[model samples]
Target chain A: MQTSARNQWFGTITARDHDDVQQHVDVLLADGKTRLKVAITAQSGARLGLDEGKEVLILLKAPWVGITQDEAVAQNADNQLPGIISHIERGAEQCEVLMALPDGQTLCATVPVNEATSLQQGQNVTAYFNADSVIIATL
Target chain B: MQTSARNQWFGTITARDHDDVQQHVDVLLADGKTRLKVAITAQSGARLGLDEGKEVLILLKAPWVGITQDEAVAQNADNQLPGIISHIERGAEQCEVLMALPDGQTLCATVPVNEATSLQQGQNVTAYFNADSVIIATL
Candidate 1:
């Protein structure tokens, strides 16, 4: 399916927790690098047939991701990828910041244009987002 | 303190978990009606002195949030808030969907213009986001 979500990962389900009314699922990415956790409703989880060993697609909206000058500034996000600012693209209202991680992976975040002024290329930073911002899809 | 993040919630920490390099924190909303979870690096979590009963602010980027037509469609998000579509503002590339919860709380999400074509005012929908999308902020 086509979506505007920018961060996409292909992974296999390693864990599933159905507690209360929500289903907590953990998927190990194909890179064998990290796991992405997704929480969906029990009904939706049943509809998707979420189970261990199931391969799924994880989608995260780029705009929902935030970039901080230090990890200390973002203590609420589960995923904080440290990297160096590689590029900055400005638009009328928002600016897109690209970071190059040590692992050679690139992550992008869109922030308000005014806030992007303090950001510069080559600066050390961290890109982060909450696990709840991640959406899961079945192939 | 000023942050580029748009959504801010003031709450009190209700729980804390330390696992490996990450720290998971749960904060009870000021309204006393809801709780938000935030995950951060262990080092940062320690620096912030995140303990149960500590007051903190939760920050979230508007773009990271997603809105679906119904609860059944978005089982992936842990925070599925049922609300009415109160407003929609269209831009050249994206549209902002505003949802008003029964508790009088308002949530917003930016979606692609093409995908937002089916949305209408007053329609019942669910505003949701992953737990990771929620960033914790401190004063």
Candidate 2:
């Protein structure tokens, strides 16, 4: 593996667009309804030969996942996704919050204990991430 | 340096909180009003001996910085602070967007070219990140 990640989300490259400095790629996630965006250097894009219809792997560290019940919080992400807090598993110094998307797929977020206190199960929340927080690879 | 980062944010350790698996530390940025949060393993925290009143160095990769005009977007972040786009410097395949806080310090985010198009200078927005996206170092 090139790098380790919390989970591997597989998707299809829906679109590939770029500017002088960066490449913006749109991915239709495995769930079909969920879409994600990734921002990387143009050179990396060229090296990867990112193309439409190609199967792509999207990786994110669970700690990097941002979850909030507020609609406003969802608006700031490079990719905004809506979900419900399905479970909150507490560990020694951390807790894992599992978010279930409408399509039945789940995204996990692990936060430090202190920070996890505010999270609740069954609340409709948004799981968001920065474009840069994403890791893309070919399947 | 062991690992390279886009820029360094200096701050004071405001709080150290933890659970079994993770350490959650709060830092008051040099900008004073801006507070950033970090989540790491408890073992790492103990190794660093993070304490209140100690100075800290917070590192981030520019690509992981999330910027948005929508307050909703800001709500999802572990650290959400308001700022205005002070500048947008474009290069061949990437662009760096500079965000100036009220305290005059600036945080820079480098984006791939295509994603930089919607960014504008002088617009009020919130720059945020996930707690796990932050790297904390001792001075």
Candidate 3:
């Protein structure tokens, strides 16, 4: 399906941790080394027929990406990655920032302009997003 | 991008209600008669270069969808639609439900298994999703 949500990747379901309400699914990104933690309902997991070694689709919106200069806040997220700021576009009240991941993927973050005033291209930063914010899809 | 978010549709930005923190964007779905309210950050709106008459891609995850047997609770959501339960898949603790919308779109919801025991296919229901739960993307 062609969707508007900015970030999409193909991955393999590798690990799972869950209870009654939610499940933390480990999806090893297509790059193999990079893993994304996805929080989905057990029902959803079953609905999608997810299992270890099962290929899965990962989806995330640009706005959901979190960029933090500090490492601690980034660590709080289930999926935290070290990235370099690639570029930025500023608006009257907001700024769109793009970061280049280690695996040649570009992660985009939309943050308030005021909060992004000090950011610049080529700066190193930590990009993060929570497990719950992730969406898992079937092909 | 092919997103994992299940609900994907095209809409026109028709109305906007905003503050410094957030914006309530009214999107007229492609059906022309159906309208969806999207909640996006001012930064996201600016990043997308959104404005009246601008066409947008509306993204909503299946799990972010809320189903209510009562209309009152559904009314609490920024976007609520009348739907009929189409099908369901049950897991140990969760249930995946499909609801048919008036516009021929299927809205999917993942709820707890216990909460879904009373639900049956063909039953009248209300499906809702919050503004913040929606993700908007540009073409």
Candidate 4:
């Protein structure tokens, strides 16, 4: 039997007061080159079906997405940030994301945060930051 | 030839305003069975230490632990939120971090934020989000 290719992209989705679509950054390896791209919309009515000008989360990790019982009851109490999904665009092979922060800020990374599966519009997601996938900067 | 056990932990360090410490959380594991604790504290007055009540960032991510040149630059951008390092503590094999948010909010988490180095008070550091080592929350 042939094996199906699993979705390996990673990121997060955030919905503030319901009904908004923002953007996120996706980092992927293509043709032996790792590149970073943004998923923000260039126009008011993009055809991606995501709510325009909303917020989203940029998860640095993927496949290991997790949810807690407490999160089900109170989603924002955890390591979750409230934002809007402002951009959702098709990429070379992966989806691009751009997450808008609460203070009118934003982060661009590569990962899949879409309206498919359990992650949809207006869904509150928890961004997972693990140990090995981090880089510390000191000044 | 002899080899030491490879460090299973890694993170980034960043500082804004020469006194702020902000940690970025890249991966958060949902398994209650294996909880990762992050805390911080100030060194004694003799040690050119952090202000009694400064803000700090306690970032958490996982699976890979090492530093790179590219990551060093990523944490300095406007996207990273600012905070202060409240305190730092030592453990048998880990580091404790406590941090305060810009609005005077406080939070905690634990990790080996330093791959092979040690963290101290009054120092500004950035915690890099490790995108490769995330453990998803299971249903």
Model 4: CA > 4 A from native? A1-139, B1-79, B107-109, B113-116, B127-139
Candidate 2 lDDT over residue span A17-110, tens digit each = 8665566889898888788888765555676777799777776767778787667767877888888899988896668788888988778777
Q: Which stretches of model 1 miss by more than 4 angstroms?
A: A1-139
Task: Return the lDDT, model 2, position A49.
Answer: 72
What TM-score would every model get versus the actual structure?
0.51, 0.54, 0.65, 0.25
Write the residue-wise lDDT of candidate 1 on B7-64 in tens digits: 5567888988865444568788887977666655444457677788877877664566
lDDT for each residue of candidate 2 in B1-139, tens digit (9 for 90 to 100): 2222354678888898867566688889886767888876555567677779978777676777888877888897888878899998888767878898887777777766787789999988888888887767665
Model 2 residue A67 distance off true place after TM-score fit, in angstroms: 0.7
Is 1 or 4 the stronger prediction by lDDT?
Answer: 1
Candidate 3 collision pairs: none
Compared with the true structure, model 1 gives a TM-score of: 0.51
Q: What does fnat come to for each candidate?
A: 0.01, 0.21, 0.19, 0.03
Error of 1 at B25 (Å): 1.6
Each model's C-alpha lDDT?
Answer: 0.68, 0.74, 0.78, 0.29
**What is candidate 2's local distance difference test score?**
0.74
User: Model 1's DockQ?
Assistant: 0.03
Query: After aligning candidate 3 to the native by TM-score, how far in Å is the CA of A127 from where it should be?
Result: 0.9
